[PDB]
Design an enzyme around this catalytic site. Structure first.
Site, PDB file in Angstrom:
ATOM      1  N   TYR A  44       0.828  -1.199   0.000  1.00  0.00           N
ATOM      2  CA  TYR A  44       0.000   0.000   0.000  1.00  0.00           C
ATOM      3  C   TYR A  44       0.868   1.256   0.000  1.00  0.00           C
ATOM      4  CZ  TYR A  44       1.016  -0.322   5.012  1.00  0.00           C
ATOM      5  OH  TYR A  44       1.657  -0.428   6.226  1.00  0.00           O
ATOM      6  N   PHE A  55       3.011  11.404  -0.141  1.00  0.00           N
ATOM      7  CA  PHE A  55       3.766  10.732   0.908  1.00  0.00           C
ATOM      8  C   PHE A  55       5.265  10.902   0.711  1.00  0.00           C
ATOM      9  CE2 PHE A  55       0.650   7.235   2.517  1.00  0.00           C
ATOM     10  CZ  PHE A  55      -0.219   8.225   2.920  1.00  0.00           C
ATOM     11  N   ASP A  56       5.925  11.422   1.735  1.00  0.00           N
ATOM     12  CA  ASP A  56       7.375  11.502   1.754  1.00  0.00           C
ATOM     13  C   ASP A  56       7.907  11.310   3.171  1.00  0.00           C
ATOM     14  OD1 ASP A  56       6.672  14.324   2.573  1.00  0.00           O
ATOM     15  OD2 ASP A  56       6.645  14.709   0.418  1.00  0.00           O
ATOM     16  N   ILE A  75      -9.633  -3.178   9.101  1.00  0.00           N
ATOM     17  CA  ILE A  75     -11.020  -3.016   9.514  1.00  0.00           C
ATOM     18  C   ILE A  75     -11.971  -3.066   8.323  1.00  0.00           C
ATOM     19  CG2 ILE A  75     -10.877  -1.942  11.800  1.00  0.00           C
ATOM     20  CD1 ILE A  75      -9.066  -0.382  10.188  1.00  0.00           C
ATOM     21  N   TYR A 101      -8.475   3.478  11.367  1.00  0.00           N
ATOM     22  CA  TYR A 101      -8.468   3.522  12.821  1.00  0.00           C
ATOM     23  C   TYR A 101      -8.668   4.938  13.347  1.00  0.00           C
ATOM     24  CZ  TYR A 101      -7.303  -1.319  13.894  1.00  0.00           C
ATOM     25  OH  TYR A 101      -7.348  -2.684  14.065  1.00  0.00           O
ATOM     26  N   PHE A 118      -4.722   4.765  -0.733  1.00  0.00           N
ATOM     27  CA  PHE A 118      -3.687   3.747  -0.813  1.00  0.00           C
ATOM     28  C   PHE A 118      -3.891   2.880  -2.050  1.00  0.00           C
ATOM     29  CE2 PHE A 118      -3.570   3.879   4.080  1.00  0.00           C
ATOM     30  CZ  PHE A 118      -2.598   4.856   4.077  1.00  0.00           C
TER      31      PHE A 118
END
Length: 135
Positions: A44, A55-56, A75, A101, A118
């Site tokens: 992911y 994202f980094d 979940i 979550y 993701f």
């Protein structure tokens, strides 16, 4: 020549209401169906759509972290995606507060009731028949 594919999202699928976007479709496979309760291997990655932040981090872009389907860790967000994937298929799933979550607070990258994306690609899986055989 499409760089931005005109894909549709699946809003609240019948497998428990999760938002996923179709990127690639499984060519063929009757037995090629990763379901819950069974062992699967997926990676992911993506970005925080909540603010468009890519994202980094030192971890996410480096370490190949993978989970197994229905080990209690997943979940709904990943659950619907991976349990409806294929070994030659790929979809982008939306991890919302309730899909992740956002309740307990235990996240990894940036879990703040924000919507994250993701890319889940099911490279490995194995359907194990753990139920009593009627015949």
């Amino acid at each position: 020549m499409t760089t931005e594919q005109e894909f549709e999202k699946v809003e609240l699928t019948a497998d428990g209401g999760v938002i996923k976007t179709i990127l690639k479709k499984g060519d063929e496979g009757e037995e090629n169906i990763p379901k819950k309760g069974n062992e699967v291997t997926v990676h992911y990655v993506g970005k925080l759509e909540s603010t468009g932040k890519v994202f980094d981090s030192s971890f996410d872009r480096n370490v190949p972290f993978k989970f197994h389907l229905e080990q209690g860790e997943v979940i709904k967000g990943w659950d619907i995606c991976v349990s409806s994937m294929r070994k030659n298929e790929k979809c982008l799933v939306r991890i919302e507060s309730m899909y992740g979550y956002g309740d307990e607070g235990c996240g990894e990258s940036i879990p703040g009731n924000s919507v994250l994306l993701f890319e889940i690609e099911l490279l490995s899986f194995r359907e194990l028949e753990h139920h009593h055989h009627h015949h």
